[PDB]
Design a protein around this nucleic acid. Structure first.
Length: 99
DNA sequence: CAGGTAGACGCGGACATCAAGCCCGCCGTGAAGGTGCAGCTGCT
């Protein structure tokens, strides 16, 4: 209704980027791409794809690139002791990651 | 078996200008990606 055209242009830019990247002109591969992108089967696939976690304070993959474990999105409390401090808890509001 | 005592060692003034400082061509490639799904053989 209001912002439907924005996400429609988003899927269309994705489709035209895929067509310019592949550039296959055999057996209607562009038609098989337009069969998925121009309809809302892309929205069903985007609803299907699960695995994102939105975790910032914990990311295990820097320790090893294949280390399946638990990732967390939780900031600690502020400590009581003076001097040392970490995890930027005062200001300059954070940006989150996706694992 | 032996071999010396003593006291002092100078001043002055000056130390140069000129002009320039090269061109050319080129700098290696190879290996260092997870994850999820479909489908194929082998087995009970």
């Amino acid at each position: 209704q209001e912002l439907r055209q924005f996400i429609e242009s988003f899927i269309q830019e994705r489709l035209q980027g895929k067509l310019d990247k592949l550039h296959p002109d055999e057996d209607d591969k562009r038609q098989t791409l337009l069969a998925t992108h121009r309809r809302e089967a892309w929205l069903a696939d985007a609803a299907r794809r699960v695995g994102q976690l939105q975790l910032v304070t914990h990311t295990l993959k820097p320790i090893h690139p294949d280390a399946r474990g638990s990732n967390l999105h939780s900031l600690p409390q502020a400590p009581g002791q003076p001097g040392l401090a970490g995890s930027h808890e005062l200001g300059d509001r954070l940006v989150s990651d996706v694992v």
